[PDB]
Design an enzyme around this catalytic site. Sequence first.
Site, mmCIF file in Angstrom:
data_model
loop_
_atom_site.group_PDB
_atom_site.id
_atom_site.type_symbol
_atom_site.label_atom_id
_atom_site.label_comp_id
_atom_site.label_asym_id
_atom_site.label_seq_id
_atom_site.Cartn_x
_atom_site.Cartn_y
_atom_site.Cartn_z
ATOM 1 N N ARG A 184 0.845 -1.160 0.187
ATOM 2 C CA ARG A 184 0.146 -0.241 0.084
ATOM 3 C C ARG A 184 0.891 1.392 -0.025
ATOM 4 O O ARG A 184 1.413 1.656 0.821
ATOM 5 C CB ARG A 184 -0.915 -0.001 1.535
ATOM 6 C CG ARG A 184 -2.087 0.789 1.160
ATOM 7 C CD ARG A 184 -2.394 1.164 2.943
ATOM 8 N NE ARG A 184 -1.621 1.983 3.569
ATOM 9 C CZ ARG A 184 -1.390 1.965 4.857
ATOM 10 N NH1 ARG A 184 -2.049 0.955 5.638
ATOM 11 N NH2 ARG A 184 -0.551 2.746 5.371
ATOM 12 N N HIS A 200 -3.278 4.694 4.835
ATOM 13 C CA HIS A 200 -4.555 3.506 4.881
ATOM 14 C C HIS A 200 -5.766 4.363 4.277
ATOM 15 O O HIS A 200 -6.659 3.556 3.469
ATOM 16 C CB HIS A 200 -5.069 3.215 6.297
ATOM 17 C CG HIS A 200 -6.373 2.426 6.490
ATOM 18 N ND1 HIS A 200 -6.282 1.394 6.196
ATOM 19 C CD2 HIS A 200 -7.350 3.188 6.898
ATOM 20 C CE1 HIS A 200 -7.659 1.027 6.172
ATOM 21 N NE2 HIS A 200 -8.345 2.061 6.570
ATOM 22 N N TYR A 213 4.007 5.221 11.406
ATOM 23 C CA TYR A 213 4.046 4.020 11.827
ATOM 24 C C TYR A 213 4.865 2.923 10.782
ATOM 25 O O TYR A 213 4.773 2.045 11.046
ATOM 26 C CB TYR A 213 2.550 3.413 12.245
ATOM 27 C CG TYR A 213 1.618 3.519 11.112
ATOM 28 C CD1 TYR A 213 1.682 2.699 9.973
ATOM 29 C CD2 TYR A 213 0.546 4.445 11.322
ATOM 30 C CE1 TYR A 213 0.799 2.844 9.009
ATOM 31 C CE2 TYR A 213 -0.282 4.314 10.179
ATOM 32 C CZ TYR A 213 -0.287 3.725 8.831
ATOM 33 O OH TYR A 213 -1.149 3.718 7.997
#
Lengths: 323, 323, 362, 361
Positions: free
Chosen positions: D264, D268, D277
């Site tokens: 990805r 998100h 993160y």
Amino acid sequence: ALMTMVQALNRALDEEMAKDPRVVVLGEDVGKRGGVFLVTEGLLQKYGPDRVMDTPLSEAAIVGAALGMAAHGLRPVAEIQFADYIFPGFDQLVSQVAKLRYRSGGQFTAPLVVRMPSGGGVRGGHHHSQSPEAHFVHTAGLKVVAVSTPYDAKGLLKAAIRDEDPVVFLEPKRLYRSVKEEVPEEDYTLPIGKAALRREGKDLTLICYGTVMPEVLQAAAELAKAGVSAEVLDLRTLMPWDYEAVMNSVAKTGRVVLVSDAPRHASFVSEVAATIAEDLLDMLLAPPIRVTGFDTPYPYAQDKLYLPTVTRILNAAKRALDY
Amino acid sequence: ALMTMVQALNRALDEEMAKDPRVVVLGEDVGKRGGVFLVTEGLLQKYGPDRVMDTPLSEAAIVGAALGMAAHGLRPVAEIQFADYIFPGFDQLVSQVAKLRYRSGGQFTAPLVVRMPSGGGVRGGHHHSQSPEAHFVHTAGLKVVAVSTPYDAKGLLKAAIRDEDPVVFLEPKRLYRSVKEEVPEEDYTLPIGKAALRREGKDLTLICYGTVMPEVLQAAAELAKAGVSAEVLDLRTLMPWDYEAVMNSVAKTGRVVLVSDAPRHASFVSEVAATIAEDLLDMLLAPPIRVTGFDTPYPYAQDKLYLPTVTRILNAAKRALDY
Amino acid sequence: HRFETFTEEPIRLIGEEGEWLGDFPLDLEGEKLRRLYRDMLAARMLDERYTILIRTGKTSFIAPAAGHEAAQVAIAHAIRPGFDWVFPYYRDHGLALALGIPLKELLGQMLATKADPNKGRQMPEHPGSKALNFFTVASPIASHVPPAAGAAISMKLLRTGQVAVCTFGDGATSEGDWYAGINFAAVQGAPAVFIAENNFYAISVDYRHQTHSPTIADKAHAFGIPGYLVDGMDVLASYYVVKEAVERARRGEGPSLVELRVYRYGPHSSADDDSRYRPKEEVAFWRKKDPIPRFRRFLEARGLWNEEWEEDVREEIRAELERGLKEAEEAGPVPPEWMFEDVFAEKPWHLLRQEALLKEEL
Amino acid sequence: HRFETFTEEPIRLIGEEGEWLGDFPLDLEGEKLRRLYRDMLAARMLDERYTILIRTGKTSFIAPAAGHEAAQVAIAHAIRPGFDWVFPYYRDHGLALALGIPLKELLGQMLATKADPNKGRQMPEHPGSKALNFFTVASPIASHVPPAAGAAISMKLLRTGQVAVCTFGDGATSEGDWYAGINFAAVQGAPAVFIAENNFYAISVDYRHQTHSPTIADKAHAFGIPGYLVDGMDVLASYYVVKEAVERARRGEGPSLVELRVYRYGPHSSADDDSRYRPKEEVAFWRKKDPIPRFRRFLEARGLWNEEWEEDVREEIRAELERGLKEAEEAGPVPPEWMFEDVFAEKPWHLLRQEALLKEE
Ligand SMILES: Cc1ncc(C[n+]2csc(CCOP(=O)(O)OP(=O)(O)O)c2C)c(N)n1
Ligand SMILES: Cc1ncc(C[n+]2csc(CCOP(=O)(O)OP(=O)(O)O)c2C)c(N)n1
Ligand SMILES: [Mg+2]
Ligand SMILES: [Mg+2]
């Protein structure tokens, strides 16, 4: 001829399956065993494994698969062994089944039925006695029906199977073989969304359904001995419920007692009570009184006391009458 | 100090964790990320991965494991990312958590807290807007709290963490940073089960909580300008709710309007309304009017039309006042 | 020592002639071996007593555990009763007994008398004990799996050195919560041992229609934890494999999934009818595999068993059963008011009102 | 020819220098190969147009699919659009586009205009199409798995010869419904293919904290069905493995679990903060594995790609996007009353009353 609720339900299933090849039955132990309450007895033998199928022990799989089958081309009648066990498949029910038509702008539909035995009066304890209908009524997109007589059982189950909207069908287990009533073998259906007047009266309206019918009816009988004519209205369909029948009865009598064995807080009868108050305050001669299950998990030892008794219903009737 | 609800909640968690090693936080993205709404920001860095733990994506695992932890010796504060996602873990909540103390005769207990953002007004559609409190209030054994101010957030969350009974703590996400209120840095708790009077009045009672508070207070302000003195009562705790605070206000004003963004049918406000009708019929000068979310899944496009508007609330007030 | 994982053939330690098949030396003293036998007889006799309780109308429901004795007694001895935790299901009364729960409490629960520490709150076959960390049985299948994982995580974090064992049948392995709970326990390397008492049936649904994996042990692959296929009619194989999994958990190596193949000799329950879906041919085959006579032969081949002792043990057990039933019955019915107790630590206003309402009727 | 199940290393067919690594000879015509590339570019550009929609406030939410193009496009081409069924999740707009769903409908749903066949009922990234058997996206993770199993069971009982493909991310494999649904499909030998678009993250939770099984493919052992570990940044490996699983399902051999390892590239979602993160070393390492440049090199070495064609295709797509957006916007806002439609086939008394109540407003 006379038959029990189990026989009426079995007949309804047999009849619809003979009429439409798309109608299939699925759930735990519904095939060879014929169901733990024998509702599906003989159907596997007559229609085969591709029409009556035992499933793995998963309510999410049962409800969810039923949704997929219904969306694709079948007319599944899924069984949840006990109403208490719908929870493992709750998300499938409220997030997938209930919202399919709405979230898809009507592109996909869910012509499925989820039947389940419910209620106490059989010493089922915590998970063999629950009446979770409030959870369903609160979820937009689900029709909800609770039957109390063999005649209604057959007529309404046939109607549910023909209805394109998802229907949760509750069968009070204590009433499965509690009485043998005349049930025509001829093809007939009953209207979903309509209450049934069990007894006409003019002094008190007794709103009820499912599990508590026996006690409600006997309470009306006791009242008759004292010259009080109670009108007993079996709602049958909880969503959408018979608004007109309820208001017409309450307008007439001016007093109402609502009975159910489901827990009190945020229950379906609470909804009806609140609606009667909001819409018919001017017609009320007494406060709408609710006789429900207590706000506790269903107790095994005190099963006899949790389920509303004739006395408990009568005490509420007296209160409404003496007001 | 002045802080948002998120800061108030974060402070509550920090404080309780510094005070008791048993307090642990678990859920999806609560660790390094600090939570999708930042409620647990900085806790992992301060307390370590064994007290702030990111979990796999499973609500059944989160709620069930939390229940197991609570029964054994920890005091978990589980987070469900959105109230809309409590369902996959519904059986754990209603079958294991809610009934543990009861089914074990008190041998086992569940001192756990389940936090979850809720309410609409944030264009969240079907699953970023739900207010499922009714499902919880209907389940015997669960305490249910829904806060609307930073002050209550800290005070009631701390109270919940200290409470030995399972508590479902709902946080209206539209109110997470909508305002900065004075919140004491010192340790203090608030009583679970007690309403909070936001405005005293004698012409009308406005019963509400959580999500809809902004519009209700605004409606109350507008009524004032029109010479109408409305009393605003924020219930805060939905189970067990403040029976006395409710009846005292209604008895005084004689007219009540209940507001919530949760679906109407079998909702929590329907329960309160039915109780008012059943116990205070003699004190009612007008029908109990309910202004609630519609009986449809939460719509995206019509987000601001679904959530009760000041106008909607004012129309209900007028009906109650003119009756 | 380490047992083989995912074996095609279930692990066995007791030869059909009473020989030892282990690839390690038997380390259980004679006294301990005889205790395993003693507890299996006690479990079998309790089950037979249950059949009578049903007939005499003393209890309204029973879940026959005959055939599960080796598995249940083995589990009870593989852990430390009172220290480790057990998350059982309804068919585990044999395990409950072997664990040390007083018959008075077990029967009190079956009869719903005040002898039940669970206060007659649930239907029969739902025992639970705080004293012996026997998590009160819950009705929804597999709902106790996630809690077991949570308890284990708590044990790890608090460094208690405890282990949580979780038992369930084959049907339970199909529930989403079963999978979800074990997955979390595995990710956290929690001290939990998940044990399947596989009798190849979930009421009437056979294993083949339950899941497509050849075994339940194979499911362990989905969690990255060790899976074991064991002969559940072999008390020693069951004991040692479970014990190894327990020690693994205790040393912080995470959970294990142990499949104990057994057979349910009786029907699913008193509300069911076995001879309604199982070939008498299959039942007979497994009847020859009764774990009791099999272990008896093992003890006999080592001078650890004789008819006199056998009769002596049985008479002692039947006396315990009689005394246990007597105590349970004399306890008396549970008060109607108790229906409102323990919902919460303290009764809220609505429960007080509802309790007062009921009293008007009493 | 077949593919190895539960392999140590993910299956790959495209070499580092654009060479073919398959045992069997490549049997896809040059024209089809160019189509795969074309669809991946379209998917990538759609994703980039979504980013712009957020910036201008045209849409309130997006779930970046950049990095998933090889997986999504391969799936669209491995099945028969309009015949087979697809049960997707929010990040599959690339798959939806390659499947044939009109940009007008995709953008209509992102903007909640009347161009959305789903009537603006849900927030963005919830497409659905009756015409292309694209089961309307639902928000609860993995909730679409049991339904997928059910449709497959229906296809089997009705002998339609169809197959149902179900896509989901790595996080979804932790939900109980994921397991329960696949287990039932496996027992029934239903024609369903479960495909994981594993990007190693569930928002901020990494794979290691998601599950303890070394791979998602390994989970297939719990159902007794074949599991495949595939290089999801390889459009050919993804296509062939998914294709094989689909054919197996179609011939009645039951379900399969295919793990497509991807990455990805974006956060998100528009409501997320990626750079908070994830290590830059990991992100950099994967950006070097972009499926688009990788397949471009494969085509170029075979004379199936040139700079001029790239320019023309991009211009075509750019124009298609503008036209689709224009049509979506031109459709106009959804009526307020539509909020009461489709709850049931017909509006019951309470919804009629509630509708009337709102009208007064
Ligand atoms: C969630 C749920 N669904 C259904 C039931 C009804 N039920 C009770 S026991 C049982 C069989 C479970 O079988 P298995 O796990 O193999 O255990 P066994 O009884 O064979 O030892 C079922 C389906 C239940 N208790 N809970
Ligand atoms: C039941 C449920 N819990 C939580 C969420 C919130 N949520 C939305 S997307 C997401 C991440 C899922 O990740 P993965 O399945 O790996 O897919 P990806 O986004 O990485 O492609 C989460 C936790 C949800 N939608 N449903
Ligand atoms: Mg079994
Ligand atoms: Mg992911």
